[PDB]
Amino acid sequence: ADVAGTSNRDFRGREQRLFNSEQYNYNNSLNGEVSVWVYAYYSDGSVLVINKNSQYKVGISETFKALKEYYYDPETGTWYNDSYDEYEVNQSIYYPNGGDARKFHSNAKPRAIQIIFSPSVNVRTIKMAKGNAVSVPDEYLQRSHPWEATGIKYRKIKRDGEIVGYSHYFELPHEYNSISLAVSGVHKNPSSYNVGSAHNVMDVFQSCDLALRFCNRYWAELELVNHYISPNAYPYLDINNHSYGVALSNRQ
Ligand SMILES: [Cl-]
């Protein structure tokens, strides 16, 4: 045989490069996944992740209460969370002076949000409804457009010059930063075959039932990077502006 890494007869080499290229290109086909992640950062350094994976379109919608530390995974809060005092905190966030809490500031409120989409999203389709604490997009229902198109604010997460994902990050450092949150994106479709046309619309309806959700709170950004992002070949941007993910297109 020819010698490895010296000719066009390195079939092991050509097959490795096609295997990676096929994964990149399948994800971008109308048969592939589109994915969204919401990360909520708490003052104790822990991070809640909500992930949704689906064909054609994908999104996540959470209340003010559901984004607070210990709502999901309350069994981790035993001796650190006063669940009753946190009910009173909620009454004082819904209406000024409406509750009887024993804290000025709940350490369970998120300090920041990162939204990440898979590289299979079309960024011009991204929509976000960032509501007040009683789930109203813009002050009163009567004057609310139900979303903002925020694609222009998304940064490219890059590895080896390939786009591996898209990031929108915003801090909630002020006492008045009390939010509900929904986000939504559509899978790329550079074709003129509308996946929602009469021929395929019931498959999009089935995609709504088939979407898979994941929810977990990690104790540290390091634990998130090591045991969630890296093992699953997911894109990520850390507090130091360091990019994570795997470049696949035309690569060994
Ligand atoms: Cl296709």
Residue 127 Cα to ligand 1 middle (Å): 24
User: Distance, CA 124 to ligand 1 centroid (Å)?
Assistant: 20
The torsion region of residue 181 among left (phi > 0), alpha (psi -120 to 50) and beta comes to beta
Dist. CA 29 → ligand 1 center (Å): 4
Contact in structure between 189 and 122 (CB atoms under 8 Å): yes
Structure tokens at 29: 């086909």
- The rounded Å distance from CA 6 to ligand 1 centre is 36
Q: Return the exposure string of 88-111: e unless at least 16 CB atoms fall within 10 Å of the residue's CB, then b.
A: bbbebbeeeeebebeeeebebbbe
Round to whole Å and give the CA distance between 204 and 34: 13
Q: Tell me how far the alpha carbon of residue 53 lies from the centroid of ligand 1, in angstroms.
A: 18
Q: How far is the CA of 28 from the centre of ligand 1 (A)?
A: 8
**CA of 27 relative to ligand 1 center, distance in Å:** 10
Tokens at residue 72, please? 């999901």
**C-alpha separations of 252 from 19, 84, 117, 235 in Å:** 9, 55, 24, 19
- The vertex-47 CA angle with 46 and 53, nearest 5°, equals 160
Q: What experiment produced this structure?
A: X-ray
Residue 215 has which token pair? 């929810």
Distance from residue 105's CA to the centre of ligand 1 (Å): 50
In order, the DSSP letters of 40-71 are EE-TTS-EEEEEEEEESEEEEEE-TGGGSTTS
DSSP structural state of residue 219: S
Cα–Cα distance list, 137 to 130, 141, 145, 158, 179 (Å) = 6, 7, 7, 32, 9
Q: Which of 6, 12, 1, 4 is nearest to 252 (CA)?
A: 12
Phi, psi (rounded to 5 degrees) for 59: -165, 175
Enter the tokens of residue 246: 């795997």
Which residues lie closer than 8 Å to 134 by C-beta, 6 or more apart? 64, 94, 180
> Per the structure block, which two tokens stand in for 186?
């559509």
Query: What is the CB neighbour count within 10 angstroms for residue 34?
Result: 27
How many angstroms separate the alpha carbon of residue 140 from the centre of ligand 1? 42
Q: What is the DSSP letter of 90?
A: H
Burial of 124 (0-12, 13-18, 19+ CB in 10 A): exposed
Burial of 187 (0-12, 13-18, 19+ CB in 10 A): buried
Report chain breaks in the chain, C–N > 2.5 Å, as residues after which they occur. Answer: none
What spacing in Å lies between the alpha carbon of 122 and ligand 1's midpoint? 15
The size of the chain, in residues, is 252
Under 8 Å between Cβ of 17 and 250: yes
Contact 103, 95 (CB under 8 A): no
Is the separation of the CB atoms in 130 and 136 below 8 Å? Answer: no
Distance, CA 191 to ligand 1 centroid (Å)?
8
For ligand 1, the distance from its centroid to the CA atom of residue 33, given in whole angstroms, is 12
DSSP 3: P
How far apart CA 182 and CA 137 sit, in angstroms, is 10
Entry resolution (Å):
1.8
How remote is the CA of residue 30 from the centroid of ligand 1, in Å? 4
